[PDB]
Amino acid sequence: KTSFGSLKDEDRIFTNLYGRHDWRLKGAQSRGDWYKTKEILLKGPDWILGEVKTSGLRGRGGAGFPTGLKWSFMNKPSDGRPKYLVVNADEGEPGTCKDREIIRHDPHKLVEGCLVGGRAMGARAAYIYIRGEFYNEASNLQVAIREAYEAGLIGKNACGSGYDFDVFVVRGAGAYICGEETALIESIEGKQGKPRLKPPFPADVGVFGCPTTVANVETVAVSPTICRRGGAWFASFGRERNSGTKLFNISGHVNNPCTVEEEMSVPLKELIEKHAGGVTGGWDNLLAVIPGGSSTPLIPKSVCETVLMDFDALIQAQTGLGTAAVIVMDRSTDIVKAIARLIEFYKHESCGQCTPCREGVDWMNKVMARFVRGDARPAEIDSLWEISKQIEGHTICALGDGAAWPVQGLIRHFRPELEERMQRFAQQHQ
């Protein structure tokens, strides 16, 4: 296949994305969830891991690590410590609101994914770390978890398979850095959400010092559908090493901002024009698109014409796929002000642990705050570039990368607008 997109409703994993059907167990079982879960759990961890590896599922958090290879790190004999699945439900990324819809409208799909993934990795329980601002979503998920315990689907003798598996929900308390996996693990343990240094990866030392897999809501919730429908089914979508469906959150300067499920390597222009109603003022009014939420570098309208919304094509477009959150910015946008608000976000959401993020994200925000007004000189642009290169790769977690990348994308695609901003400041203030 060469052209991607135009996904059919029979090939959706997240039916009831919009709340138009019943989210409870009577609705979820009538849509295909909790069907033959016992026969999945009895075929062993190796079969489930082989279905996830065969499907080519990559991590829907945004790094795109291979999900089967990641989950197979737990497939090892125990040493007295329990093992845990931990479902990353924080979703603090600006642009991204898909996991909110998964938890809120397909909760039993997430709970069944917790059971299937925890059987795949030998996990004792599931800790779903939901964002604390998602209070109604957390109570929604707890009602679905109570319905799953009252039906014997999880807990003691889960789905009649002889496997014991709990599902816990831990609420956050307002930190974007608690979506990073080791900082999330610290946040469950009753601490400041400060990321750990890797190694140890959480498959060695995770939550409470146990073996732990932290995985996104989407990459957990699609796993029972991958186990039922098959690995080849999910791998038949998108490009190669770009397998499956993906939730997209098209927000910003589009006519109809929405969450929509779509095949993996769909064109960005086709996605915005088809599911979002197109850019406000037309496609000629498009100035920039942040492809995958705030941490990905923006790409301008010349790149957005032919770009495909999977991992490798956006890597070739010197950005990332990320959370697949499409932030559309038209020609009426002060783009320096938008990227500087984004760097302001990244210094309010930064845990202050290591030196390059704690100091340089504040220093980038001060330089960007002067770039908004133009109160600078052009030699400070490349300087700011170097500051970003002193943060990228020198930090503990990737929030330094996620704060250095928008600065780099803005400089790389809009250096002339920065320079004309600063020179008009100079000619009207001296």
Partner 1 sequence: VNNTKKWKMEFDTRERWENPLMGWASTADPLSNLVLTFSTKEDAIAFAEKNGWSYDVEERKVPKPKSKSYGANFSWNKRTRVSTK
Partner 2 sequence: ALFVHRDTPKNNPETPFDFTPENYKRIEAIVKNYPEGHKAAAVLPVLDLAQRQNGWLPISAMNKVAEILQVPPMRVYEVATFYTMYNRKPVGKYHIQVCTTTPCMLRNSDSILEAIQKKLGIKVGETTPDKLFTLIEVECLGACVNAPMVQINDNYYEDLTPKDIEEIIDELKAGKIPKPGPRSGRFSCEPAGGLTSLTEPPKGPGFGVQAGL
Ligand X SMILES: NC(=O)C1=CN([C@@H]2O[C@H](COP(=O)(O)OP(=O)(O)OC[C@H]3O[C@@H](n4cnc5c(N)ncnc54)[C@H](O)[C@@H]3O)[C@@H](O)[C@H]2O)C=CC1
CA-to-CA separations, 89 to 296, 379, 415, in angstroms, rounded: 20, 42, 36
Neighbouring C-beta atoms of residue 326, cutoff 10 Å: 25
Backbone angles phi and psi of 6, in degrees to 5: 55, 55
CB 137 to ligand X: min, Å: 15
From the list partner 2, ligand SF4, ligand X, none, partner contacted by residue 16 (C-beta under 5 to 8 A by kind): partner 2
Q: Is 257 in the site for partner 2 (CB under 8 A)?
A: yes
Q: Is 322 in the site for ligand X (CB under 6 A)?
A: yes
- The dihedral region occupied by 376, where left means phi > 0, alpha psi between -120 and 50, and beta the remainder, is beta
CA dist 245 and 257 (Å) reads 19
Q: Which is nearer to partner 1, 173 or 197 (CB)?
A: 197
Helix, strand or coil, per DSSP, at residue 74: coil
Sequence-ordered list of residues with C-beta below 8 angstroms from that of 52, at least 6 positions apart, any chain: 67, 68, 71, 120, 223, 226, 227, 231
Q: Is 402 in the site for ligand X (CB under 6 A)?
A: yes
Q: Is 218 in the site for partner 2 (CB under 8 A)?
A: no
β-pairing verdict for 84-89 and 125-130: parallel
From the list partner 2, partner 1, ligand X, none, partner contacted by residue 153 (C-beta under 5 to 8 A by kind): none
Residues facing 259 on adjacent strands: 249
Residues preceding discontinuities in the chain at C–N > 2.5 Å? Answer: none
Q: Is 101 in the site for ligand X (CB under 6 A)?
A: no
CB 405 to ligand X: min, Å: 9
What are the structure tokens assigned to 311, written together?
């991992």
Interaction site with partner 1 (CB under 8 A)? 81, 186, 191-192, 194, 196-197, 199-200, 204-205, 208-210, 353
Q: Is 79 in the site for partner 2 (CB under 8 A)?
A: no
Please name the helix (run of DSSP H) or strand (run of DSSP E) that holds residue 275, with its range, or none.
Answer: helix 268-275
CB 96 to ligand FMN: min, Å: 8
Q: Is 364 in the site for ligand SF4 (CB under 6 A)?
A: no
| Pattern 156-185, ligand SF4, x by CB under 6 A | ---------------------x--------
Stretch that binds ligand FMN, among 104-112, 196-204, 214-222, 371-379 (CB under 6 A): 214-222
What are the structure tokens assigned to 225, written together?
């559908």
Please, what sign has the CA dihedral across residues 202, 205, 211, 212? Answer: negative
Stretch that binds ligand X, among 46-54, 158-166, 380-388, 395-403 (CB under 6 A): 395-403
Q: Is 211 in the site for ligand SF4 (CB under 6 A)?
A: no
Contact residues for ligand FMN (CB under 6 A)?
Answer: 59-63, 65, 67, 70, 88, 90-92, 177, 179-181, 214-216, 219, 397-399, 402
